[PDB]
Nucleic acid binder design. Structure first.
Ligand SMILES: [Mg+2]
Ligand SMILES: [Mg+2]
Ligand SMILES: [Mg+2]
Ligand SMILES: [Mg+2]
Ligand SMILES: [Mg+2]
Ligand SMILES: [Mg+2]
Ligand SMILES: [Mg+2]
Ligand SMILES: [Mg+2]
Ligand SMILES: [Mg+2]
Ligand SMILES: [Mg+2]
Ligand SMILES: [Mg+2]
Ligand SMILES: [Mg+2]
Ligand SMILES: [Mg+2]
Ligand SMILES: [Mg+2]
Ligand SMILES: [Mg+2]
Ligand SMILES: [Mg+2]
Ligand SMILES: [Mg+2]
Ligand SMILES: [Mg+2]
Ligand SMILES: [Mg+2]
Ligand SMILES: [Mg+2]
Ligand SMILES: [Mg+2]
Ligand SMILES: [Mg+2]
Ligand SMILES: [Mg+2]
Ligand SMILES: [Mg+2]
Ligand SMILES: [Mg+2]
Ligand SMILES: [Mg+2]
Ligand SMILES: [Mg+2]
Ligand SMILES: [Mg+2]
Ligand SMILES: [Mg+2]
Ligand SMILES: [Mg+2]
Ligand SMILES: [Mg+2]
Ligand SMILES: [Mg+2]
Ligand SMILES: [Mg+2]
Ligand SMILES: [Mg+2]
Ligand SMILES: [Mg+2]
Ligand SMILES: [Mg+2]
Ligand SMILES: [Mg+2]
Ligand SMILES: [Mg+2]
Ligand SMILES: [Mg+2]
Ligand SMILES: [Mg+2]
Ligand SMILES: [Mg+2]
Ligand SMILES: [Zn+2]
Lengths: 66, 96, 156
RNA sequence: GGGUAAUUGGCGCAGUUGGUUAGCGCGCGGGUCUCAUAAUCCCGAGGUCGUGAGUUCGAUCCUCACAUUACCCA
RNA sequence: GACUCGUUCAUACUACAGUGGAUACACCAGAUCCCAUCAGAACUCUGAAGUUAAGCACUGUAAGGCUUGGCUAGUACUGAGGUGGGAGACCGCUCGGGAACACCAGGUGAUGAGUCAG
RNA sequence: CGCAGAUGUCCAAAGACAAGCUCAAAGAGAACAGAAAUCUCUUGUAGACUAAAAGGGGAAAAGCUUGUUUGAUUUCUAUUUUCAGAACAAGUAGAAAACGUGAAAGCGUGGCCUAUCGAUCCUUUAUAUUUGCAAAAUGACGUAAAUUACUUACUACUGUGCAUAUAGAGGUGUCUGAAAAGUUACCACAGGGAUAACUGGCUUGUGGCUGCCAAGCGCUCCUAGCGACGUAGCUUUUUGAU
RNA sequence: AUCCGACUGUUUAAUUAAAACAUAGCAUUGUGAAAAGCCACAACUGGUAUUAACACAAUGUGAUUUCUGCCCAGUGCUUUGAAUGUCAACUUGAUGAAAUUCAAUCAAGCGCAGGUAAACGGCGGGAGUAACUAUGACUCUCUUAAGGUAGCCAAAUGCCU
RNA sequence: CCUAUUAGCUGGUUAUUUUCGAAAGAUCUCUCAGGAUCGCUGGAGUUGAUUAAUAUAAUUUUACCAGGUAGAGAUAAUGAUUAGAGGACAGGGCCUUGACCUAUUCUCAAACUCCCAAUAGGUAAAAAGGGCGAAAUAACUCAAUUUGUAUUUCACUCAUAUUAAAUAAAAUAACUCCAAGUGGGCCAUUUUUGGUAAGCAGAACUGGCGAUGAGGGAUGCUCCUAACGCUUGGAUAAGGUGCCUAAAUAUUCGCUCAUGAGAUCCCAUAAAAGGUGUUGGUUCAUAUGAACUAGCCCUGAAAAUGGAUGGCGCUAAAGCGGA
RNA sequence: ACGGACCAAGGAGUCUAGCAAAUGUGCAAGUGUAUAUGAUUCUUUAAACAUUUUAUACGCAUAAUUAAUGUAAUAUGUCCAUUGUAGAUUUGUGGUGCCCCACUUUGCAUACAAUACCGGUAAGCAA
């Protein structure tokens, strides 16, 4: 006995039962394998900025509490 | 397929530079009677039960791959390289 | 048997137009790109390196990576009940700066001065676009000698 | 996979034997007792399956026809 | 009046014609040297006797091509409705969208940056 | 079990880079030379060539001829095609190292692009200043002292054989991968109208019957009786198809 | 009058009584004995056997008459053996610190060389040619281990029929 | 006795009401009467919204993009194909028929293309953001301790109450966990492949049957209206108003006579060819002669128990086309 | 298409092991009194009650990673508790009606990213 071998009848009714879902729209993505020699420099820039910020905040704390 | 017997290429062992190599062909080598698998099989085959393992019979391929053996001439370390399967292979012949 | 190759079914898609063969111009190599830009993927068959896949010919996305001669693009694709983000890596000849955005940019720039002027005179400004609507009444002058009468035609 | 033999004029084969080498029959034509002239003597084209240290090898490291018996965990 | 690097990539191409040479662009005179071939033809080098014949620039053909409008034409085709017509093959109505070839007429370019002469 | 076809290969160059050049074909012309040998000249948007099916691409080149070469090299990521968005495999964009070519900008991680292939277990060779073999030793008493000996301090490099980590290879074409010949007319069991051998049902190619037109036959004369070349139906007393 | 079986005999208890089985006659094979042939048994021991080639055991055909053609290439069975290739354990030797590793040698089989068809079985095509046609004694050619002989037939054996 | 051996296979599998509600596709499989995996469904739980907003959308609008199907063409390329015409190497001794070239001419393509729709697709339409300045951090980049580029910090400012275009019982949202049942399908309009065709076999979009009853089609799983808690009253849809049968032997115009009339989706068969039946219309020839055209009717029209516009019957229709 | 002549009684997702998710309960860097022993426990009681007169039975958890010899989580400048964007709650002013807005203050859970550190591997050095 033979049988059917293909149809996509009823497939987009099943697709629309729970709608067509969408991507998530995040704010950041991972830079794992992207352009190097540019993100290593960025790591250095951010370390310098953080050093300056923390030193100013710590100095302000030191004089405020005396 | 015609491949010359010498070749100047990168050496990955002990001197990270292009040096002069010799090229030959790799061969299997004979199974040794004291390896662990062969000892296990030879013990399993004794006794009163006939054959104990499968024996392949449905052969399909007619060629083999042509892995080459390279050897640095400054250091004496070696390395393997695979080529596509072919039917006729020559190691140093008359040029076109 | 079945034949689903990488370039199957692209006989007319990937062919040059009439009297327009040959490689690209030299100014194509001076185009500027930046992160987050909108871009169109149009395959150019006379450059065989880094061609896109069949599906993506004619789609639009955003840039997430720039290299020596390549660009990464984020593109949506429908799979059977959802939409997936695809990461497409193509070479620079198959890339074109998208024009889908320009009306919004011109609108912003032009509306800036109207807002600045209206607030400078302290007026009330409306800047949203207007949908075409119903038409008002008017008085149309027409000499009687200019109206031509018609009627259905006989068969021939 | 293993052991043995074997490849030497066109055909069947000898030889082949380290500073010693390549022949016979057969096949093809020449001078010949010129009444089947059977039988034939003197002549030529004629060759070592292919590599190489070591010189001169047929010794020897490898692969290429073929033959004999036996062997088999991807 | 001319040149160098570009952009549109035929309104910029093709075939015949006419006109032009202050400086420039060329053809042009040679082979010692760098260089190159069978061949100083080409390529490379060194020059300044001659010429607008040719390249080049502008213009002309009831020129071919190309390009822009008009017409072909609400024609061919087509989305939605119909207990519409017709044995069928096929074809109208209601609410909407809408070509192509051919033919006729005009056109044959425009421009960024930097210099030379006067 | 639609249509026209192809695959289990091939290449030390038919791979990489640079430079010079232009191809098929036609016309006219030159001793032997003729339809076709080799020479000049005009025209030439590819009508040639590019390993192999078909499609796409290609002219100061991707084609032809030269010159120099081994980027067909070692290691790692982000990912595309099939898709469960698993493997394999085949691709795209990149990073670290050492090189080729070219004056240089650059190009090169095989073949102008789309096919040309393979798990666990076992075996086999390569790599390592990384490991093991269950109370211990094997280079070596090495180098300095001291003895009257079971003396003290220092050291990257330590027996045969086996095992193990990492990389390639030996194959499963029923190609996500069992080690596998027949017969039953003496026959058994679980099932199947998911499936054959009758009647019935839809169809009517084939079988059978009836029509339309008028070339010609009928001595003469289209139609008393017929009717070639072509065309419209009916039936289910044949055989098919399902 | 034709077919089959020679005859008397036997058979599927309960769907087949026959052309089926048996039979006398014919042919072939093994074996000279308690160390033999054929067969039983776990082992010890047994059957034929109270036997001895005019015997016991294993097959085929099927009275009398008249006959029994060709093939030993294939598959079986059988005969000879240190000229002879391959083919185990044991054994001997070499090396090594030893476990190993590597060599050498008259078992039977197969191979090499023969026999055998009343063993299993096998036993061909094309073309021309005689005083009318028709036919082909005759000839040429390809080819097998051998090419269906004496006979017999639309037969319980021939599709076309 | 082992033994209640094993079965991807047949048969069966016990109280009520209420709420939600499927699949018969896909990948792999000694797989095709099986299974695992995705999809479709239920139940728990948190995070949100409750502010006529924002997130959101099987829908439009405005801006932009990609395409080679319908159509067309053959004088544009490739491949087919009929016929003459005009010009300047074969032929029987200045002429056949040719050959070659030039402009034409009849007809074509799923595996042809100069051109090219309708429909169907994709991206965008502002506050965790945009614009404009200054300063600081880098081992990156550049000829550049200023060249640029990220990032960070301070200033100023960009429509809202009509919400940066319309509309919206748009939050009935988003996301985790644990699981069932399915993986033999079929039918209708439009598109479409094989076949003479089929209530045949095989695909596409949507709606259904299955899983679903009510009114109509006489009857009928899939057609038309319309989807379902228990009632009272009103007014409809589809379809009907001579009797069967609730409601017109209603009104107002035409046509038709049948010795086998006719009677509306699916739907329950009819053709070529004919008519001096009757009714309208067009074109020719001085009230006659023709030639065409299309409505109803008629010939063409033969099967087996006795029978079917559903029945009776109907002709100043109770038939056909309208109002 | 198959089973069903009729009536009464009987008649089919259960038990044990082992794992997970959900939920209720107790305690919490711990938690669970194993086998036993004790008691003025002994119809019931085969239940219930107890724990050995700076306190090392065992399981799971509190630390990972590697074939393995093994090695093992900011680092001593400060008991401090890494960085940013959005975000519940709190603090101070003003607007319209304790609620919602605007500014200001604090910054849970969680989502998306960055950074430092531990074990294996590669690379560069290397007694
Ligand atoms: Mg001139
Ligand atoms: Mg013109
Ligand atoms: Mg081309
Ligand atoms: Mg070139
Ligand atoms: Mg090439
Ligand atoms: Mg399989
Ligand atoms: Mg498979
Ligand atoms: Mg059997
Ligand atoms: Mg059936
Ligand atoms: Mg018929
Ligand atoms: Mg008898
Ligand atoms: Mg009798
Ligand atoms: Mg009987
Ligand atoms: Mg009887
Ligand atoms: Mg008998
Ligand atoms: Mg006898
Ligand atoms: Mg007899
Ligand atoms: Mg024999
Ligand atoms: Mg022997
Ligand atoms: Mg036989
Ligand atoms: Mg005979
Ligand atoms: Mg007879
Ligand atoms: Mg049982
Ligand atoms: Mg419901
Ligand atoms: Mg079933
Ligand atoms: Mg397309
Ligand atoms: Mg068409
Ligand atoms: Mg046409
Ligand atoms: Mg319904
Ligand atoms: Mg009906
Ligand atoms: Mg009512
Ligand atoms: Mg009534
Ligand atoms: Mg008349
Ligand atoms: Mg009725
Ligand atoms: Mg009625
Ligand atoms: Mg049954
Ligand atoms: Mg019964
Ligand atoms: Mg009961
Ligand atoms: Mg719990
Ligand atoms: Mg450490
Ligand atoms: Mg030291
Ligand atoms: Zn080396």
């Amino acid at each position: 006995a033979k049988s059917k071998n293909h149809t996509n009848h009823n497939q987009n009714r099943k697709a629309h039962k729970n709608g067509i879902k969408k991507p998530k729209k995040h704010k950041f993505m991972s830079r794992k394998g992207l352009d190097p020699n540019f993100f290593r420099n960025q790591k250095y820039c951010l370390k310098g900025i953080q050093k300056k910020k923390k030193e100013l905040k710590l100095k302000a704390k030191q004089e405020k509490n005396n | 397929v015609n491949v010359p017997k010498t070749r100047k290429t990168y050496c990955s062992n002990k001197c990270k530079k292009h040096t002069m190599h010799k090229v030959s062909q790799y061969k299997k080598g004979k199974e040794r009677l004291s390896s662990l698998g062969r000892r296990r099989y030879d013990m399993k085959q004794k006794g009163f039960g006939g054959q104990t393992k499968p024996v392949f019979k449905k052969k399909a391929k007619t060629t083999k791959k042509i892995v080459l053996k390279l050897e640095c001439t400054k250091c004496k370390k070696k390395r393997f390289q695979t080529m596509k399967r072919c039917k006729t292979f020559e190691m140093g012949a008359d040029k076109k | 048997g079945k034949s689903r190759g990488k370039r199957s079914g692209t006989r007319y898609k990937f062919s040059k137009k009439f009297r327009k063969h040959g490689e690209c111009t030299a100014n194509k190599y001076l185009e500027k790109l930046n992160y987050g830009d909108y871009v169109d993927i149009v395959c150019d068959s006379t450059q065989q390196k880094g061609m896109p896949f069949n599906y993506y010919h004619g789609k639009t996305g955003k840039i997430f990576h720039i290299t020596k001669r390549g660009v990464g693009v984020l593109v949506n694709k429908r799979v059977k009940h959802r939409i997936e983000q695809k990461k497409v890596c193509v070479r620079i000849e198959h890339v074109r700066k998208s024009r889908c955005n320009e009306d919004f940019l011109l609108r912003k720039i032009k509306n800036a001065e109207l807002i600045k002027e209206a607030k400078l005179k302290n007026e009330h400004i409306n800047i949203k676009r207007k949908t075409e609507g119903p038409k008002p009444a008017a008085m149309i002058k027409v000499p009687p000698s200019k109206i031509i009468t018609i009627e259905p035609l006989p068969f021939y």
